[PDB]
Structure 1
Amino acid sequence: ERVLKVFHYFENSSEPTTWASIIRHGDATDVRGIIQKIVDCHKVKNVACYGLRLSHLQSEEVHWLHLDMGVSNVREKFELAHPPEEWKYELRIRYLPKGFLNQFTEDKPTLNFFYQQVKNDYMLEIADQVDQEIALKLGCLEIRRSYGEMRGNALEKKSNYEVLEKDVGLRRFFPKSLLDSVKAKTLRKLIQQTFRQFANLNREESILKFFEILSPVYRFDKECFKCALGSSWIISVELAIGPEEGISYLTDKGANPTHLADFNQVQTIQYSNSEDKDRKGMLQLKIAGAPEPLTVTAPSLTIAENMADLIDGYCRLVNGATQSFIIRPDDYAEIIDEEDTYTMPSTRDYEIQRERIELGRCIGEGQFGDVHQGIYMSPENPAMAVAIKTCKNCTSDSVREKFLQEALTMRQFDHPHIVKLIGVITENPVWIIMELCTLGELRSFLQVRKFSLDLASLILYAYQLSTALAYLESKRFVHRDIAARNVLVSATDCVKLGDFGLSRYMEDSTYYKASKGKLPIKWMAPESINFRRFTSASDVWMFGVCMWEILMHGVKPFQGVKNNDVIGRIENGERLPMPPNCPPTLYSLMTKCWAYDPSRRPRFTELKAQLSTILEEEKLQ
């Protein structure tokens, strides 16, 4: 079963780039018939025009993908490489005839496709960057386009513009450097006066206006490349290939490019590697009636092959060709509507959208603010029960950066018992993705659920923590404050370690330092109390404090004790008494972790192996 998801820019109802191709295809399926189907699903003229492209979520180098290069062969060639959920496929225009605005004015759906496309690259690269008035123009053009039938006096009104700026929220297409820079009534009046003049245009006309104003700030007709040109004295330039010029290239970054020939004169194409270990590609260009090749060498065979496709497809387009002028050295598909959407992988997007959220209420309180419960919406397995934490004060950037540091650290984990953060927010009050622990804190449940606990339950609590902090040691961070207050319950047979505010990555080199905060002493380990030395030693220690308190029914540690007397009685090697009904080897391992030799307190991985054995003995006997 071969299924492919192909993003595109054919307008859909809900959010603007969730335009997702469910394509079922065969083993021999070419890109030709796939996209043929995709466009026949939208009654379009332009046929040899859309460039199919590759995309790796966690990278930036891509492949403008050939057609007869087999679909399954791509799937081979780049799942031999990396897992698919980071891979991704993208379809785009790459080609434009002479008056492309006109020969796509005849084809309105492709005009919208190119619109969405060009604007895509815009909002990627230059959205929060190019100036105020530029983006205001482009944004109110975006208004009048997306609104095919809105009035002209629509946004003249007080409350009804409050509608847009609040309920919609203009993060969709108005960018940051404006929107988080202006007063309320100010920005009201500002975009009023902007929108006053664009009251009337339709899809076609609004869109051609967009191009009219968008041409200078970026040459969307082309895509600028850098390379080096020459036969055997060679020089490293910028490069430009587009319909406005055919093929020309520069003498200054600011030069009017020096034309020499168009795509129309092309005979054939070839790409090949730079002839050394550099990750680079040659590019030679034989042309009609030319004894001469326009030789180029640029940072990649990747883009070399892609540029070969560039010339090949303008040849196809603005001649009568539809064939491969690239000199190299049965099958049916069907666009799936919904069915079961089998089968997407996991997500990794950091930026968060604010529409698909349930607003929650009090679940927990953190150092930076209240905690919340909500659900996120996506493709398969949607409306996921999820949670968020927010900061009460946004006047200090410092706590903002720590609040960020949470997620920016907590990204990279991977285990069945480390909690599922996904995303990042970037405005006040910045909030968080939380895999909600439905059960909540284990101090309160243990306190009020005395008759709802079992010997196996406490052991498996410790077992989950075992594998958890084992994985920490496999990937080197010192949590510094492990506690049931910071321990969450997912379900009756499943706990999870949280609270990574104090967690640090050791360069494996010895200790961590100290900053500020009244961390509880009774829980803390002696060497660290004395010298700010948090390592595997105190890890095993407070791990044992945790195992203890779990098995205590979680009564407060060192009951009726003073933090100064604590370390003195530790210097008297005093450890806390066994519980009632405590089994032997479990307590034995607790004592092993109670070794006043911090170096010889045993590790969690070994304790987990021991906990695994103690758990079986308990369930057995």
Structure 2
Amino acid sequence: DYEIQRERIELGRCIGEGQFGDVHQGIYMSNPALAVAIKTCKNCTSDSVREKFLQEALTMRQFDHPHIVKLIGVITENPVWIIMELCTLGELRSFLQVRKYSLDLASLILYAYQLSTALAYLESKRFVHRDIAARNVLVSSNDCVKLGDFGLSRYMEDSTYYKASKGKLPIKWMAPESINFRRFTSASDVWMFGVCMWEILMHGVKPFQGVKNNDVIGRIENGERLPMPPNCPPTLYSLMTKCWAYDPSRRPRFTELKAQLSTILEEEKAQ
């Protein structure tokens, strides 16, 4: 059981918003002052909303990986809260932007490698993430990145259903079979990981800048692909282009991606 008493939580400032409501930072008095992320649920007095929200905690509870945010616990009494591990250094895109001159290439490859370990782990549990993008990656330390909460990562996908959402469908990250037929598989996750690796090597710059979402599929179906980032090792760019094979059966699996990223990281650290 992972039920937590509310008195042990000090609710701090709002750090973002999810589909169910504001996400706050806070402190969990367990150590007596652990930093946490707290998902809140504005419509949780409705049984169906409460079930959908608590299912997001059940989803995270099944995973245990060094590069995925951990579920700390739940408060099932109103207001219903989900307590997650806080990654103290924040969002990966902002972190890479601040260090666009500071961070070394070996650190960028390390983050792609750590993410491939988390994704090989999800693949081993037959879990399809659906939104592998730098926006859904957090920074725990200078040498550690983690995939953020999975419910919160579906914010862009879910934006089509929420009139007040600031989000937009993540077309620029999606595999063609996902855009065309709404098929989400372990192979479509590999395509998205390729785009995520491109974002990291680009220091948090978004893919297809200036291109309208509606114009993405036509470019991809005409054979267009994201260019090699400046300073990206050619072996790493060849890996990204394999992730973007139009035929999903031609894309590598995460076991091979992790092994190849480990070799690329070793070769970079050696020079």
- With structure 1 as the length reference, what TM-score do the two structures score? 0.40
Aligned-partner SS, 2:150: coil
Aligned-partner SS, 1:508: helix
- For the 8 Å contact 1:544–1:593, the answer to whether it is kept is yes
Please list the CA deviations of residues 561-618 of structure 1 after superposition, one character each: whole Å capped at 9, or x if unmatched: 1222211111111101111111111111111112122111111211110000000100
| Matched residues, number | 271
Which sections of structure 2, spanning at least 5 residues, go unmatched?
Answer: none
- For the 8 Å contact 1:506–1:512, the answer to whether it is kept is no
What is the match of residue 90 of structure 2? 440
What is the match of residue 356 of structure 1? 8
Please list the CA deviations of residues 361-420 of structure 1 after superposition, one character each: whole Å capped at 9, or x if unmatched: 122222222222222233xx4432222111234454433222111011111212222222
- For the 8 Å contact 1:481–1:502, the answer to whether it is kept is no
Residue 369 (str. 1) matches residue 36 (str. 2): no
- For the 8 Å contact 1:540–1:604, the answer to whether it is kept is yes
- For the 8 Å contact 2:177–2:188, the answer to whether it is kept is yes
Aligned-pair distance for 1:482? Answer: 1.6
C-alpha spacing 1:516/1:377, structure 2 compared with 1 (3 Å): closer
4+ runs deviating over 4 angstroms: 502-518
Aligned-pair distance for 1:515? Answer: 16
Give the number of the structure whose residues are more often helix, by fraction: 2
- For the 8 Å contact 1:512–1:533, the answer to whether it is kept is no
What is the match of residue 598 of structure 1? 248
Cα distance in 1 between the residues matched to 2:29 and 2:124? 33
- For the 8 Å contact 2:21–2:40, the answer to whether it is kept is yes
Cα distance in 2 between the residues matched to 1:513 and 1:481? 20
C-alpha spacing 1:512/1:586, structure 2 compared with 1 (3 Å): farther
- With structure 2 as the length reference, what TM-score do the two structures score? 0.89
Aligned-pair distance for 1:494? Answer: 0.3
Residue 487 (str. 1) matches residue 124 (str. 2): no
Residue 568 (str. 1) matches residue 203 (str. 2): no
C-alpha spacing 1:503/1:513, structure 2 compared with 1 (3 Å): farther
Please list the CA deviations of residues 209-258 of structure 1 after superposition, one character each: whole Å capped at 9, or x if unmatched: xxxxxxxxxxxxxxxxxxxxxxxxxxxxxxxxxxxxxxxxxxxxxxxxxx
Aligned-partner SS, 1:373: strand
Aligned-partner SS, 1:518: coil
Aligned-partner SS, 1:422: strand
Aligned-pair distance for 1:516? Answer: 15
C-alpha spacing 1:438/1:508, structure 2 compared with 1 (3 Å): closer
Aligned-pair distance for 1:438? Answer: 0.3
- For the 8 Å contact 1:511–1:533, the answer to whether it is kept is no
C-alpha spacing 1:596/1:404, structure 2 compared with 1 (3 Å): same
- For the 8 Å contact 1:388–1:432, the answer to whether it is kept is yes
Cα distance in 1 between the residues matched to 2:166 and 2:187? 21
- For the 8 Å contact 1:478–1:503, the answer to whether it is kept is no
Aligned-partner SS, 1:482: coil
Aligned-pair distance for 1:523? Answer: 1.0
What is the match of residue 112 of structure 2? 462
Please list the CA deviations of residues 409-462 of structure 1 after superposition, one character each: whole Å capped at 9, or x if unmatched: 111212222222131212332212111010111112222332222101111110
- For the 8 Å contact 2:60–2:70, the answer to whether it is kept is no
- For the 8 Å contact 2:159–2:168, the answer to whether it is kept is no
Please list the CA deviations of residues 486-524 of structure 1 after superposition, one character each: whole Å capped at 9, or x if unmatched: 111101100001231289999999999999995211111
Aligned-partner SS, 1:522: helix
C-alpha spacing 1:620/1:511, structure 2 compared with 1 (3 Å): farther
Cα distance in 2 between the residues matched to 1:517 and 1:476? 27
What root-mean-square deviation, in Å, do the aligned CA atoms of Structure 1 and Structure 2 show? 4.7
Cα distance in 1 between the residues matched to 2:200 and 2:190? 15
Cα distance in 2 between the residues matched to 1:450 and 1:515? 30
What is the match of residue 41 of structure 2? 391
C-alpha spacing 1:365/1:514, structure 2 compared with 1 (3 Å): closer
Please list the CA deviations of residues 526-562 of structure 1 after superposition, one character each: whole Å capped at 9, or x if unmatched: 0111111111221100011111111111112111112
- For the 8 Å contact 1:541–1:593, the answer to whether it is kept is yes
Cα distance in 2 between the residues matched to 1:402 and 1:615? 40
Please list the CA deviations of residues 322-380 of structure 1 after superposition, one character each: whole Å capped at 9, or x if unmatched: xxxxxxxxxxxxxxxxxxxxxxxxxxx322111222221122222222222222233xx
Aligned-partner SS, 2:8: coil
Describe how 1:502-581 pairs up with structure 2 within 5 A. Answer: 518-581=168-231
Aligned-partner SS, 1:555: coil
Cα distance in 2 between the residues matched to 1:403 and 1:427? 13
- Higher RCO, Cα 8 Å, sep 6+: 2
- For the 8 Å contact 1:359–1:373, the answer to whether it is kept is yes
- For the 8 Å contact 1:352–1:425, the answer to whether it is kept is yes
- For the 8 Å contact 2:159–2:165, the answer to whether it is kept is no
C-alpha spacing 1:605/1:369, structure 2 compared with 1 (3 Å): same
- For the 8 Å contact 1:479–1:502, the answer to whether it is kept is no
C-alpha spacing 1:488/1:513, structure 2 compared with 1 (3 Å): same
Aligned-partner SS, 2:160: coil
